Amino acid sequence: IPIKVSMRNLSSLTIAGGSTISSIDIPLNPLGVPPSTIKGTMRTAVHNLLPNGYTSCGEVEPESIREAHKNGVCDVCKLFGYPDSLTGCFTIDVSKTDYRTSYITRVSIDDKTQRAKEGSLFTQQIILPNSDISFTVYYNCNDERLFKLLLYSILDLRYWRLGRNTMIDVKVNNVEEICKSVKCDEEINGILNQLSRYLWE
Template sequence: MELRFKIKNLSSLTVGGTSASATVDTPFSSLGIPGSTIKGVMRTAVSNMVSSGILKGYTSCNEIEPEMIIMKHKKIGGDCDVCKLFGYPEVEGRLFVGNIRLTKEKFKLTRVSIEDKTGKAKEGGLFSQEVIKPGEEFEGEVILDLAGLDEESKLKQVKLLLYSILALRFWRFGRGGMIDIKLEEGEKICKVIDCKNIGDLLNELGRWLYENSVS
């Protein structure tokens, strides 16, 4: 199942990475916005929703270290729902997130590091960062592999994916950025699974959350 989405950055956005040509301290990744970055943020954000009890009915091992993941999975008698969707080291999940190529202009922003203790600028604390200015839109794509699942498991994976996308709206993205995200043609999902219980979620994801906050 393929789903397209749009991302809008609400704040200036930097996804750090390497860039041979950049003359700034923190260049924008030359890969654009890597799918692995988006997937990583989705995973962290939705794990947090599950383990804090905001999202009920799912399991999450909430671990990063491969050994800890395996240990927790043994405890709960199998892979947790989050790992089923996102995979974990050496085990592929069901979700693929495409890279987003960058076609927007990048700006150099100079910032000042502030010392936590004193709240004053650090000496020599100037640094520069490559950013995309707020309010730009990007298009991306996710692919969810539902092969071999019964109807109930399909619905469960799709719902977890939708909540992961929703969770991106409330989580830091890149270097402290905030983004909005919406699904394009989310109703396509209803050709694959029975949508009657996820209508509200699809509606919610079909529009920008922060409609008027960026001009």
């Protein structure tokens, strides 16, 4: 079930990728925004903002993940996949490319005085705000509670940082096919309506 999600950053969004040829203190990924960044950020938001009636490992160590999975549910961990049990649950791909770029710099003001610290000046590469990013979340499994959890994940992504504490506003450009596919629930309809438009008009 495809989910055509369009996200537009509300600030000077940026991520650090890398390049052998680079000079900016804060690099950028050559392709743009990778699916891994989105997936990890969404998982973090879900764990920190966990909807009622769900379980989250909230662990980085795979051994700790296994220890949490000793009981063995971790609804969030099931949605994002066991380390070595399930092949997968959902996929993220980004098609749009060719973002805008500009080099800015930042300082660190002294505390005792109000002047900039001598030698605390570093630069940062950013993506210009109000730039649209479209990515599709292909959920291949067959489960409604996990699908609702994924929708809650996307919704919570709105109230969450994405790269250098940069605010974002997620928008879903498909409600008709989502309702047509399966489980056009009233709660599902309400959350999809909430995600249908930007939080900030």
